[PDB]
Each structure stands twice: as C-alpha cells, then as structure tokens.
Design a binder for this molecule. Sequence first.
Ligand SMILES: O=P(O)(O)O[C@@H]1[C@@H](OP(=O)(O)O)[C@H](OP(=O)(O)O)[C@H](O)[C@H](OP(=O)(O)O)[C@H]1OP(=O)(O)O
Ligand SMILES: Nc1ncnc2c1ncn2[C@@H]1O[C@H](COP(=O)(O)OP(=O)(O)O)[C@@H](O)[C@H]1O
Ligand SMILES: [Mg+2]
Ligand SMILES: [Zn+2]
Length: 385
Amino acid sequence: LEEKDASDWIYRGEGGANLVLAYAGSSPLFVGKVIRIQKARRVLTSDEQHLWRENNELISSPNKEVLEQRYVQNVIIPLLGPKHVDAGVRVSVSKEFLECVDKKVTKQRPLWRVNAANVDTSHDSALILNDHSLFDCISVEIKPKCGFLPTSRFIGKENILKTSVSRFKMHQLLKLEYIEISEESEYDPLDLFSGSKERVLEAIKALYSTPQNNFRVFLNGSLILGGSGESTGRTSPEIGYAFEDALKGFIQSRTECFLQLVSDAVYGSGVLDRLLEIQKLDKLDIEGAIHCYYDIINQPCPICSLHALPLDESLKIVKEYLIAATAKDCSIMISFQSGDYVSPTNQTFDYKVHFIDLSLKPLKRMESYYKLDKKIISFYNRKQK
Ligand SMILES: O=P(O)(O)O[C@@H]1[C@@H](OP(=O)(O)O)[C@H](OP(=O)(O)O)[C@H](O)[C@H](OP(=O)(O)O)[C@H]1OP(=O)(O)O
Ligand SMILES: Nc1ncnc2c1ncn2[C@@H]1O[C@H](COP(=O)(O)OP(=O)(O)O)[C@@H](O)[C@H]1O
Ligand SMILES: [Mg+2]
Ligand SMILES: [Zn+2]
C-alpha cells in the first residue's frame, strides 16, 4: 500500500485509539472494507508478557496490529463465539501512505481529537475489517458500556452509591463537570442489558434522544445521526426532522418504527447477554482488582486478605479485569436491509450484528482506572445533598 492509494480512503470516524477509513475505490480487494489505523497519543511490557503468558502466539506478536488480531482471535473469540466477531486481516502500509492519509482526514476530525493524537506513522501494518455499515443499508452503532452493578466486599463504606447507581450515570456528572458533554444522558445501560424487551426499547429511545458517543446511524455508510468521531448534543427538533427524512423509502410509512425495529433486533439476537457475562468478568470491581495489580508488578500496595493470594490467582483476576474492560468499551453494529430477520408497515428486515473495538487494554492502565473510579464516586458523593 502506497502514498497514492491514500486518495481511495475516506474518513469514517475514530475512538480514543484508532482512526477508521472506508474504501471509496473500485478495487475488488477493498470494496466493503474499512481500514483501521492506530494512533499515537502524546510491544508488550514484561508484566504484560507474564499476564497474557497463557497464549504464546499472543505475546510474541511483532507489532500492535497482529497483537489486537491475536487478542480477539485467541482470547476474545473463545468467549463471544465467532458469529459476530471479526479479527480483521492484516495489510502492509508505507510511511508516506499514513502520513498522506493523516494529512487528508484532519479537516473532518474533531479538534480535541487532533490535539490529543495523530496517526502512528511508524507502524508498517494496519487492520482491514468489513464495513458493517454495508450489507439500501441502515446500520446502527451502539456503545452499551457497563450494564451492571458492582457488589464487591472491597467497596468502602464511604462508597455505598456504587452498588446502587450505574457507573455510566455517575460518570455523566463528571463528564458534564469538565465540559465534555452538554447535558446529562437519558441513557441507562441497566435498561439495555436488563434482558427485558420493554426496557431495551426504553434504552433505544433514550439513545436516540441524547446519543452522545453511544449511538450512531449510517445510511449506506454516511452518518445520519450521532457525532462524527465524537459525542453529539441532544437530538433537537431539526435533527429529528432530517433523520426522519433520511428514513423515507427504507421504513415504509418512521423514526418510532425505526427504534422499535432496532429494539426488536438487539433483544431477539440476545447479543447483549453474552457481552454482559464477559463484562462481569470484573468480579471484584477496581477497588478490589487494584490490590492484585500491585502484587502482580511486585510493588508495595499504596492503597493499603486479597494480598494473601497465590500469584496465579492474582494474575487471573487482573487478566479477567482487562478482558472485561474490553467488553465494557466495545461497540455493536447492526446492519439492516429490507432466522435473523425482524418484522404495522408489514415489512420484514434482515440484520447482522457485529462486535467492533475489542481492544486489549494496557496493564499500566490499572492505575488510572483506579484514579478515575476514585474521582467519579467522590464527585458523585459530594453532589448528593
Ligand atoms: O474509562 P471510560 O469508561 O470513560 O472509557 C473510555 C471511553 O470513554 P467514555 O466514557 O465512553 O466517553 C473512551 O471514549 P472517548 O475517547 O471518550 O470517545 C475511549 O474509548 C477509552 O478507550 P481508549 O482511550 O480508546 O483506550 C475508554 O477507556 P477504557 O475504560 O476502555 O480504558
Ligand atoms: N467494521 C466496521 N464497520 C463500520 N464502521 C466501523 C468498523 N470499524 C470501525 N468503524 C467505525 O469507526 C469508529 C472507530 O472505531 P473503533 O474501532 O471503535 O475505534 P477506537 O479503537 O478508536 O475506539 C467506530 O465507532 C465505527 O463507527
Ligand atoms: Mg469502540
Ligand atoms: Zn492493597
């Protein structure tokens, strides 16, 4: 892949860690593909090698692309089944390709995403996945987050709100406080993962209203609702109307029909149940896991029973924490086009559900995970009153 192929890629979005471009070309090699490119903010550490030592191919990975590839394949797939997970094929890229591509997209990237990161033009590799906004095609991206309450004996007396109130809902307050969002989200993950149909519908309405970085809709691969590479403001009446109009033809009628159809899809695919069992791989909560983290790296625990545990035990706990970290921050894409089908307008739609962004979380991140958790609850406690 060379500098001149850069033209054949168009901006599609990004998260904290990767840039994503869809193919606008004619090449059979790349039709229906997106290209996923790692960013450098501004291979495995010794402790990681040991943590994930159970998979040897995984920890001998030469670069980060093959790393995520094997992670998903060897650690995640066995857990979520391969029907909705794609580990993505690896492709070679040149420096001038990434540089040029990076030059190209800056214009459509959000400002604070540009301040924080660019493309890591030092990588000689990049991941090619299937464009899930392509089966007319209406795809929907959901970022569910953690859909459960912690229950740990390791959550302090001073933190009696963490077993009652979702981490999402507490985080909304902090986000708002640092001018990262404009108004509190109506979305509640507990509704989405509730495994009740009525309550999934509730969550999907809630997502439509205040989408933030949790909800997005694409027509033939182009954003029609939701922020581009970022969070977006509440859906205003102008937004409502233009999204409504973007629907014509697809929903024979429209917005409420669409949300019902999304709700029925999610629910009847039970794709969120399996995801939830993985998230729940966080059996102790950070307030528990962090102690094990300090044993692992053989550092005296600054935070101070959990320490009386065998290394292998401590290791599996921090391992599964990170694995749940991954499930807690992945996303789901559901493709729609007129056993996996959905049905007033009398239409029946086919649909496909995929997992995206199953990224391996850096072990070092256990420290800032604890720092942030600490910050979330102490800000939520203060507020009540
Ligand atoms: O810590 P969280 O729960 O806020 O999750 C982060 C997400 O924030 P969110 O609350 O969804 O707005 C966050 O999303 P944004 O960057 O805020 O769009 C990232 O996806 C981040 O992962 P990473 O930086 O790409 O490795 C996420 O970090 P991890 O928890 O996966 O390490
Ligand atoms: N296979 C795919 N099909 C369609 N869109 C995708 C695909 N992979 C990524 N994207 C788009 O690009 C965005 C960034 O993807 P993601 O893998 O979440 O990046 P990050 O690792 O930075 O969080 C996603 O939110 C999604 O809309
Ligand atoms: Mg993601
Ligand atoms: Zn400790």
